[PDB]
Design a protein around this ligand. Structure first.
Ligand code: HEM
Ligand SMILES: [N]
Length: 184
């Protein structure tokens, strides 16, 4: 279960974040580990498409090769805090698993600048028990976390040294698909 009420960035600039570009997850912190994907790859595109706030997600397990894309319409709770009902799709946007009540994630932008961000997400999917997940994002897939985002990690009362890096996984992304999915 999730336990954090993440605080959104003071002065969060929604148009800059939701500009249609891609964000790569460089480091993550899951508060309920299991025995994971200690090795994982993820990226997202965020933007407004035909007046609707959307996000397109990509997940890839670099060891098992398990891959999936999602598209979500985001609903606003408050500045920088959203609720997203996702639909699993192929890379071209064809639906594989339709939107279902009960299958959603919350998303909070705790910090963001033009190149980096810190987010919190709480996933709800059917029957699985899931916990809070924090992610450090960058516009450059290979960027080491800079002082602005690491300071935000500290301000959230988290230890950046506990975050797991995604950089040693040889991850390659289909950026074109992520961007096109925003319209689906
Ligand atoms: C912006 C960051 C992220 C968001 C918004 C997000 C969102 C989601 C959503 C919506 C699903 C369900 C998709 C579906 O069933 O169609 C999912 C599944 C999953 N995510 Fe993420 N995720 C993010 C980052 C990550 C990262 C970094 C990891 C690495 C630990 C991760 C691990 C997983 C796994 C293992 C599942 C499969 C859950 C299952 O079905 O039991 N995610 N994620
Ligand atoms: N996730």
């Amino acid at each position: 279960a999730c336990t954090k009420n993440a605080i959104a960035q003071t002065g969060f600039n929604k148009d800059k974040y939701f500009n249609g570009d891609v964000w790569y997850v460089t480091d993550y912190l899951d508060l309920e580990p299991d025995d994971v994907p200690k090795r994982y790859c993820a990226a997202l595109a965020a933007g407004t498409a035909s007046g609707k706030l959307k996000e397109a997600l990509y997940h890839y397990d670099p060891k098992t090769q398990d891959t999936f894309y999602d598209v979500s319409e985001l609903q606003v709770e408050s500045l920088g805090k959203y609720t997203a009902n996702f639909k699993k799709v192929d890379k071209n946007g064809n639906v594989k698993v339709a939107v279902t009540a009960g299958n959603y994630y919350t998303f909070t932008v705790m910090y963001a600048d033009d190149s980096s961000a810190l987010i919190h997400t709480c996933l709800h999917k059917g029957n699985k028990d899931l916990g809070d997940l924090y992610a450090v994002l960058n516009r450059n897939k290979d960027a080491a976390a800079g002082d602005k985002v690491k300071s935000a990690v500290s301000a959230a009362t988290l230890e950046f040294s506990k975050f797991i890096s995604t950089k040693e996984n040889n991850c390659a992304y289909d950026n074109d698909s992520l961007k096109s999915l925003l319209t689906k």
